Symmetry: D2
Subunit: 115 residues, 4 copies
């Protein structure tokens, strides 16, 4: 599991469950190609998006569908989604955790990268 996504809810103090996550990889023609997608679990985590074989060097975009999450809770939030864009595996394979802590008008996002 070289790529994991974790989402937390700062209003409730809980994992953000059933959040849609779409991952894209930048192609040679400079366009965003769909790479993987899924929904966060009861722990606010999304595992099994990819494999070490498939997750080659490149520029990746993780789109976290925060608006649909807040709308289902009765909040009209500010952002359409939280977008995380980064170069992966350029010095060899790494394990990446992309995390976001969500509020209606804000989000904090960070990465934990391990060898």
């Amino acid at each position: 599991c070289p790529l994991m996504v974790k989402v937390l809810d700062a209003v409730r103090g809980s994992p953000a469950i059933n959040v849609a996550v779409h991952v894209f990889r930048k192609a040679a023609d400079d366009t965003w190609e769909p790479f993987a997608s899924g929904k966060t679990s009861e722990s606010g985590e999304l595992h099994g998006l990819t494999t070490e074989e498939e997750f080659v060097e490149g520029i990746y975009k993780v789109e976290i569908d925060t608006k649909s999450y807040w709308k289902a809770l009765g909040i009209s939030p500010f952002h359409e989604h939280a977008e995380v864009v980064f170069t992966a595996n350029d010095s060899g394979p790494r394990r990446y955790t992309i995390a976001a802590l969500l509020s209606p008008y804000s989000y904090s996002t960070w990465a934990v990268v391990t060898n």
Copy 2:
């Protein structure tokens, strides 16, 4: 100006100066059209991006070039840039401040919407 961008540096405890900022508006064909751009001032602020006349309801993207900022400081960053995507809605008079607090492997972003 109805749209202001503010960028802060959490490593130095200072405004993030000379940061490139690009604003886009989503077109009918679903593509991102360049809308406005600039560089943050000595106060980490970017004023005068648009006018009330030009800034109509729509979906906007604010791209903050964080990678170039960290590279100029000799600090290895994670993100290619920080992206803020939101709908501008005419619910009475409004001013939008899009802010970001930057760290090499994280950023927090928020919006202050006032009348």
Copy 3:
């Protein structure tokens, strides 16, 4: 004023108004002595807490009464308050801005120190 406090609300996307703020300075006996206090304005800012003469090097604590703020909004909070503890150091001319971005179960706090 060499010390300003700014508080923002991440649920509403607005300044956090009428928030009580208490500043303390650590005394020789290791206890926290009241130093200054006030309430944030309509811009979420608290100015005029001290003067350059009074604000000597020392360890200071800024306590932001977040619980009372959330309770007045009918939102169940986690923290009793947000506490910022720091040393003020005379390394040339300095102005300190202590800022906090509040959510019910989280807060981000940062400092902008300028000349």
Copy 4:
């Protein structure tokens, strides 16, 4: 394990290892009584601070020794420590994760509370 502390480093994109953490509980005389302490592991986590029996209702303070952490990395940080003050177990036993994401001039802290 009803109380766990997790600390992350936003400069390195890694767990914050060997961070000292002190927990206090407010006593009847309004003073902070030492309750538990420890150091974060290689995963940036501190488990086994207390037991369900010992962790009774009360006001608790978790002091995360961020200054010593940054000083050991060659950074002179802004804060003396990150302080998290909260009421625990007032509606019955809960499991609490207190987390902090650290930068030299900023920190974000949140709680994940589960039943």
